[PDB]
Every structure is written in structure tokens, then in C-alpha cells.
Amino acid sequence: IQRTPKIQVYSRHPAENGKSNFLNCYVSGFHPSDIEVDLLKNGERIEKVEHSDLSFSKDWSFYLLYYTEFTPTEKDEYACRVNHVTLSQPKIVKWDRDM
Amino acid sequence: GSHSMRYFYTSVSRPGRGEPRFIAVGYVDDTQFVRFDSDAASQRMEPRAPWIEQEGPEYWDRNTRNVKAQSQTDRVDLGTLRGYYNQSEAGSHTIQMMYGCDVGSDGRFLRGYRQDAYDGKDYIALKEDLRSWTAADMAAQTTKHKWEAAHVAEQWRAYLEGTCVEWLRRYLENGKETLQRTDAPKTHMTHHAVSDHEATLRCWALSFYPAEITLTWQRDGEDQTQDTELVETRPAGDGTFQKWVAVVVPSGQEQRYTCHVQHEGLPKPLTLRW
Amino acid sequence: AIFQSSMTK
Questions:
Q1: What are phi and psi of B77, to 5 degrees?
Q2: Which C-chain residues 1-9 have CB contacts (< 8 A) with chain B?
């Protein structure tokens, strides 16, 4: 079976320009586990990105946390790019500090 | 209150070249404490919580040999189940297993469980009495008979009611500074005008542990679900969790609405008002 | 600590 990923993009701490924080991309409810996830800064891929150990929910659907240290600003745009077999095209989800 | 120890395994065949990806994670309640990833350099069971690092080399040797042994079982089973289902060797397939035990507040056995899946669907599971198996289909039924002829369930029961509970008590004691501590949710509410007439109120729960939480909007004392949104609980990345719930309301009427937060870390539920 | 056996399916 195949399940399309849910995607949340969010900072570990309340976002404040000029203050170091962690940018999270939380992908879940997907299957199979094969998945490509990148964090983007103004369209470019961030290199030093970590992720958690693959795990899963009650319905066997997988979940992962991708994250990187970063410093919010006014002009810098951040996003999470997720590619999965269920997606006809890589999905790009822009970070929204209010969510 | 009650606690649990759980392990999650995932194996994924790779027909292009080489052997399956195997990943194991162990939790006590909502805290990950060990991991093994076949793609990792160590090829060891690795620590992921400070309180497990005190275990001696023996602990690490046993657990490492055993997860590796289990990864090899998964490799075999991937091949067998491909056969049971008459599938081509060109396809990648997945086996997952979650097992664990629960204890109560007094540290007494509460329940045990061990279920597995193939390609994201139930395959075989241990019944609640830990004596027999539930097979989801005729492939699993083939396994069930074989396992009942070998009394696999007995070893699982002996572990789930015995070994599993004992180590769970041990970890809970060694890591009591964190494992037996609740972090209540830190709450607050934000107000996003959508127009001159409507606004979205968002109720935040942050930095809480454990992950289980109830967030509800009330309007004049009664629960509301219309015009509400409720994101999945998510990891902050530091061991704690986050969640929020929101409602669209008519501007000026904000004070009618209350957010209600239930959590183990809260002796009495919280109610927030704008 | 993890479960020690691993009968095949």
C-alpha cells in the first residue's frame, strides 16, 4: 500500500530574527519508507541536515524528523522539499512561523 | 502512572544491490534510548539517552548480536514472504515489527504485545493472552502453523512478562530524573485576523512530555469542532513535543472561546481565554 | 533489552 506524506515545517522555539533556532521538517503518515527530504534556504539545499531514526505509527505508517540549526530573518525564506512515490512532483512546503 | 518499553523494527529489501536496510529503535515511554541502523558505520546498537550509557560492554554485545541476528531473520523472511505472495524479486518490500510491555504505577506487569506487518499491512500478531497468534491472511496462516508447532509464543510470553518488565523497571530507575518526570505543556494563544469580521485563534501546547495530550476548543462552555483545525502532535527535537488547535471565530467574540488542555503533567486541566 | 530469539516466518 501507498500513503502520501503529511508535512509540517516549524521551528523548535518561537521564531525571532537574529536568534539561533532549529528548523524542523516533520514527515509522517507515509508508506513506503523510501523518501527524499531537503531543507531549503531561499531555494538552495542546506547541507548540514540531520534526521531521526525511522519509526512508525499504529497503522504502520512511517514518520521522520529532518532538522538543522538556523537563524530566522525577515528576508530569508525557508522550506521543506519532499519527494515520495505518491507524489507526481516534489512537494515544496514553505515554513510559516505561525504554525 | 503507567510505563512501557517498546521496540520498532523496519526491514526494506533492496533488489538493485546488496542486502536489506534494517533499522531498530527502542523507547521507554516516549523517549528513544537505543538505535541500530544497518547503514551506520558502527554496526552496533548505539545509545541515545544518557541513562543507558551506564550499561556495561556485556549489555552492548548481547543487544548488538541480537539485533543483527534479528536483521538476518528479516532478510530471510523478506525472501520467504515474497514466495508466499508469489512476487517478483525485482520489487522492494518491507517488514515492520513493534513489540513491548506495559507496567502500572506499582511497576507490575500490565500487558504485552508483539505484532508485525508486510508492506504496511498486518501480517501476524500475538494475541492478548500471549498464547496464540492472529494471522491476517493465508500467508500469515502458514507462519502461524509453523510457529504453533514450535511454540514461538511461549518464548515471547516468557520475555514479555519477564525479561521485558525487569529491564523496564531498571531503566525507569536509572533514568528516573527524566523518565519519571512530566513536563506540563507551556501554553499560550495567538490571534490572526483573517478579515474585519473573522479571526483565527490558535491554542499552543509546547515543550511537553510525554506526547499524549488533549487540546479542545469550547464556545460558551460547550465543545466545538466546527471551523477547527488540529495538527498532529510533533517532536520539538529536544525530547519534548508540540501541538496546536485553532478555531475561526467572529471578531469581537473571542472571549466566548476557551482552550482546554489535558495532560499527565497537569494535576488540573488548563483552560485558556483570550 | 531486546528479545533474543528469531524464528523465521
A1: -60, -35
A2: 1-9
Asked if A98 is an interface residue toward chain B (Cβ–Cβ < 8 A), one would say: yes
Q: Which fold has domain A1-99?
A: Immunoglobulin-like (2.60.40)
DSSP B47-101: E-SGGGTTS-HHHHHHHHHHHHHHHHHHHHHHHHHHHHTT--TTS--EEEEEEEE
Region of B157 (left: φ > 0; alpha: ψ -120 to 50; beta: rest) is: alpha
Neighbours of chain B (3+ CB pairs under 8 A): A, C
Method of determination is X-ray
B67 in C contact zone (CB under 8 Å)? yes
Best residue in B10, B42, B78, B137 for a mutation probing chain A (most A CBs within 10 Å): B10
Residues with Cβ within 8 Å of B43's Cβ and at least 6 positions away in sequence, in order, are B64, B68
Provide the β-strand partners of residue A13. Answer: none
**Binding positions of B:** 7, 73, 84, 116, 143, 146, 159, 171
CATH superfamily for B1-181 is MHC class I-like antigen recognition-like (3.30.500.10)
Residue ranges per structural domain of chain B: 1-181, 182-274
Q: Which of A86, A31, A35, A85 is nearest to A60 (CA)?
A: A31
> Is A56 in CB contact (< 8 Å) with chain B?
yes
Superfamily the domain B182-274 falls into: Immunoglobulins (2.60.40.10)
